[PDB]
Amino acid sequence: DNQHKKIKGYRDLSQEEIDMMNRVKELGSQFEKLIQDVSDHLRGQYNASLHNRDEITRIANAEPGRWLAIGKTDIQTGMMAIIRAIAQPDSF
Amino acid sequence: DNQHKKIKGYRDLSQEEIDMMNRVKELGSQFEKLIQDVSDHLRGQYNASLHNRDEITRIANAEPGRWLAIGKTDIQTGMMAIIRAIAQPDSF
Amino acid sequence: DNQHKKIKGYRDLSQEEIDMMNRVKELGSQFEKLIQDVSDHLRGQYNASLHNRDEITRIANAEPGRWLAIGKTDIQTGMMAIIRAIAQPDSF
Amino acid sequence: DNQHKKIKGYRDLSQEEIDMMNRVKELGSQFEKLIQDVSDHLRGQYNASLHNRDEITRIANAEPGRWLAIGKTDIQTGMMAIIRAIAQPDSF
Amino acid sequence: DNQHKKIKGYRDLSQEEIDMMNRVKELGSQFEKLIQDVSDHLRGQYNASLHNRDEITRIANAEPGRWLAIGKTDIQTGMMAIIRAIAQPDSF
Amino acid sequence: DNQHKKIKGYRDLSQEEIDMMNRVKELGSQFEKLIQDVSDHLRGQYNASLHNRDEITRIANAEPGRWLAIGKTDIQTGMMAIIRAIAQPDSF
Ligand SMILES: Nc1nc(=O)c2ncn([C@@H]3O[C@@H]4COP(=O)(O)O[C@H]5[C@@H](O)[C@H](n6cnc7c(N)ncnc76)O[C@@H]5COP(=O)(O)O[C@@H]3[C@@H]4O)c2[nH]1
Ligand SMILES: Nc1nc(=O)c2ncn([C@@H]3O[C@@H]4COP(=O)(O)O[C@H]5[C@@H](O)[C@H](n6cnc7c(N)ncnc76)O[C@@H]5COP(=O)(O)O[C@@H]3[C@@H]4O)c2[nH]1
Ligand SMILES: Nc1nc(=O)c2ncn([C@@H]3O[C@@H]4COP(=O)(O)O[C@H]5[C@@H](O)[C@H](n6cnc7c(N)ncnc76)O[C@@H]5COP(=O)(O)O[C@@H]3[C@@H]4O)c2[nH]1
């Protein structure tokens, strides 16, 4: 019970603050779905092109799965930073 | 006309690809609105607390405007990386 | 009371988990002190060298205050990522 | 001998500067130990929960090992940036 | 034809702008070659030292391939950010 | 003399290693010049458009100076990471 009191820097949050944090989290869920959809597109693109070496080489050179992972991490850490701006912990 | 042909690594894109890129951009617009709303909350919070030194010191120590800017940059660069995964330029 | 239940993805945490999170936060406090000490060194270095244009130009070109801010942000976001690995939210 | 003279932008450093850089490196060693401890916790958590599919799915969805790696990289690059603020190379 | 008009925020670009963007891309190609050369050095270093456990352990602890990948990503995203400063999309 | 021995994790470097590190630094100097050129373009663009509010608003919304600074930092930290892959310090 009341885990936050045990965590350093955590402070009490009002309903407005919690609602804003949850708004950020919800938008992120939409990004997650978009990322899954892009991953699904990539899976199809790769499959459609196996045996067509030129396209497989082009896709390997574009590295789209690596870039999608980069984007996912930036989206998640940006969400965390916005939420920190709302929640405002009293610690480094 | 056809600026992309002049830009290195840029390739022709199908309507499905362009639609996915635009989907990413649209979700980002929603993030922009959320960020503005958080900035507006912060402006109000600061204003409501001027002359209450303890709260002004607490807010200064939490640095919420800096964290909001950090989050904005991560959201934008993540969008760029997801869009690169869709668009797949043929260059470093 | 029990703010975490209202925040999406947040889950109950055991004492061991909270103790590890707090360990991360404590180490960060040590980094904060080190960063302040470096900022103090920089303030002195700059002061000692005003009127010695060559050194002031060299310091301006090294941009040490900007680099210290870069380091501070990376330390804080790394702390946040380690703490997320311990706390393990059930959301994007 | 005197490798630094051969490296562009590297400049001579006083004992105080070297001591501060080493202070940063030492604090980092403490972070390394903490990261290993978290990795050990994660290994145990996973092991304790194999055959309990719901928990294994939850852990896979939280991606704590990926987040721990993210945190490690941010800690290391932040250390590098703080050390650059102390050492102040005369190059881009 | 004219894919840019279909992509949100994309604007018409003059020849000077496109030439600057391509200048960035070209410099990046030079970085790609340097990165390949470093990867080749690492491959040789590892090979030359197999059976010399102490050196293999030292290399594993330095993690140079991971650091090279980190550097590659930072170079590519920095290129993207400079190009965005030139191209100036009218969107988030 | 021999400052590196006093810095933790620093190891002796061969001429080939130092030459590769310097190659990275040199390429970076080329990036610095390109960044200055882009900054100069931006200064001119802004100047040419003062009193044309629509263009000044568009430029303010694109935030090209902020994006150029983002790119500069990513280029510099990527250089640092590549150089760490060559130099291979024996510390966290
Ligand atoms: N002042 C204050 N009071 C709070 O109650 C509170 N709760 C969170 N925060 C801070 O918000 C910011 C963003 O949170 P996010 O959920 O994105 O990341 C969180 C989330 O991924 C995870 N986490 C924290 N608590 C829990 C929890 N109870 N369950 C699951 N995951 C958790 O660990 C990350 C980092 O936490 P901190 O980096 O220590 O504090 C956070 C951070 O500064 C708070 N700040
Ligand atoms: N002016 C100046 N004089 C110096 O003697 C000096 N030594 C280091 N630095 C700069 O400090 C900053 C942080 O150093 P860190 O050790 O975290 O990263 C270092 C470290 O990981 C690695 N490295 C450099 N020299 C060695 C070395 N001799 N042995 C092992 N690793 C080394 O390569 C990284 C990047 O070096 P640079 O990015 O070229 O210069 C560094 C950087 O700006 C110096 N700056
Ligand atoms: N205003 C404007 N008009 C343009 O014509 C234009 N073209 C690109 N940009 C923006 O430049 C910046 C850097 O571009 P880079 O090529 O590094 O990344 C690009 C590139 O990796 C990829 N991409 C975009 N279009 C194509 C394309 N036609 N073919 C291949 N890859 C493409 O997707 C990345 C992100 O694009 P955005 O993040 O939506 O817009 C870019 C970005 O802001 C433009 N901005």
UniProtKB/TrEMBL annotation, chains A, B, C, D, E, F:
Binding site for 2',3'-cGAMP: 3-4, 10-11, 25, 88
Signal peptide: none
UniProt-recorded name of the protein: P26
Organism: Pseudomonas phage PaP2
Gene: orf26
